[PDB]
A paper describes a structure:
The SOS1-catalyzed nucleotide exchange reaction is a complex multi-step process involving the binding of RAS•GDP to the catalytic site of SOS1 (KD1 = k−1/k1), followed by the release of GDP to yield a nucleotide-free SOS1•RAS complex (KD2 = k2/k−2). To highlight the power of this platform technology, we describe the discovery of four representative Nbs, including competitive disruptors but also connective and allosteric stabilizers of the SOS1•RAS complex.
Nb77 was derived from the Q1 subset of yeast cells and binds to SOS1 only but not to RAS, as supported by flow cytometry and Bio-Layer Interferometry (BLI).
Residue numbers in the entry:
A (entry chain S): 567 to 590, 596 to 658, 671 to 743, 755 to 1043
B (entry chain N): 1 to 116
Write the structure that this text describes.
Amino acid sequence: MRLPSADVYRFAEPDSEENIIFEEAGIPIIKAGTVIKLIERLTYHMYADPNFVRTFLTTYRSFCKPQELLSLIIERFEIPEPEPTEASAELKRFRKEYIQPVQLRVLNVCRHWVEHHFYDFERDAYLLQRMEEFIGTVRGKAMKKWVESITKIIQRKKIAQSSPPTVEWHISRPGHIETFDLLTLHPIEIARQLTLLESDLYRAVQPSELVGSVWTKEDKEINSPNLLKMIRHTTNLTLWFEKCIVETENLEERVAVVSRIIEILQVFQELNNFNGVLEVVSAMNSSPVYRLDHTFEQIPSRQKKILEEAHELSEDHYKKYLAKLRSINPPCVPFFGIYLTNILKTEEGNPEVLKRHGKELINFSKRRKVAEITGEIQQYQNQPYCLRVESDIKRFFENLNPMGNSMEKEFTDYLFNKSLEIEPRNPKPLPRFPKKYSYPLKSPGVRPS
Amino acid sequence: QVQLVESGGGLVQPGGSLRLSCAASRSISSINIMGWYRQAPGKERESVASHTRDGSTDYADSVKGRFTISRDNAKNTVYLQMNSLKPEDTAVYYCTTLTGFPRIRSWGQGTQVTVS
């Protein structure tokens, strides 16, 4: 059981409670460790641990930079000669029982890295250069098989049922981009195109964009671009619904706006776009909208029912929503915000490091907990809709910018005080306001052609 | 619905101050609107102050600058801090919530405030 000295090879330091802790028996579950110990167990000489490699490569950016990880696995790979007894059999055993397994597991880590987290190398061309140069130094028949599989993955990554229904149109005509609006597009097609858009945004989020609250930090535009696009779309669309409502000062027109949004909601439900469903529910519960007694008074009972049923999905910490999401059949778009809430709760209720005898250990169980949440997200990221894109409508909703250059605080105050203008507080009477729409308010309904 | 329990209130000199409190039987963080109304003798009941989850507030004109509505999530309580009280503020004050779809309004018991 020979080994190089821990002075010339850091990974040979003995396990202790001050550098690695396991969960409270064949393969242990790591709870915490120094980065050096985590990497040793990532590439352990005694066994492979795919589940640990999986969790590590999803979460490691919360405790180690990508260029740093590559440096550490190179350090891991380049094993020095073992420390000598005063006096080949023990030498040969070291190369067969230590060097070869460790170096193979390092290459497996590199393969998993490019196979499932190639975006690290798309964001950092030099990281990919270092990796290609490193695996280029590898010698031996057994390991060139792994070099070959890594190289083939990299090359492929550099390169990269039935008819959908007819697109529906209402007042706005195809190609008439300047006429597109809440009441002028067909409510079926608004819901379809937003569902296609939100399906795409949901499917693009990588689990690592969700780790370590990295989307609320300094490099967020590089580390969480797809997550940020999702969140900002949900903000812009929700605020656009509120804006369409309160900027419609005439009561009859505003009832038509709210009714139409409930029809879009109904189609979201039929499409299992729970993301869209809860965006509508959020708009209807918002400060500027929820207080509009005179508007909700005129909503027909059947639509009140649809809104009430969507709202109840959110009660009791989304109990009915979680039940409905289990029971539906694909395709769907899950409600994305609930995962962010659960992740932030996990991030806040667990420490970044654990202490043992004054030494700091990366709390890996905390990363595993977040990774389990991101795994449930992934289970829904391959469910395309049999719906045709309308490129102009898609662009209309991609470009929604209700706030303009203002910030959400001033903008929300703007919406809320507008609400007070159109429906004054309860002693005051209700003024009449001019119409703003010259086209008919009557909905075409949500039955397809 | 929501059971609402008011406290505070009573008699105070003109120019004095008083804080009403209203405790909810459920978590206020999911209650869209909490507010206070009042009915002075001879008049109809009027809204005094309201407060939404995101902190948006509105007030009767006659109390702007003097009254402040706020929430305390840890105690599931909404407050009405009333400063610079005037004899025209004498009334029964009522805690209220509006939340959910259907939009359910709940009411506290009513609390006498006398400024004389």
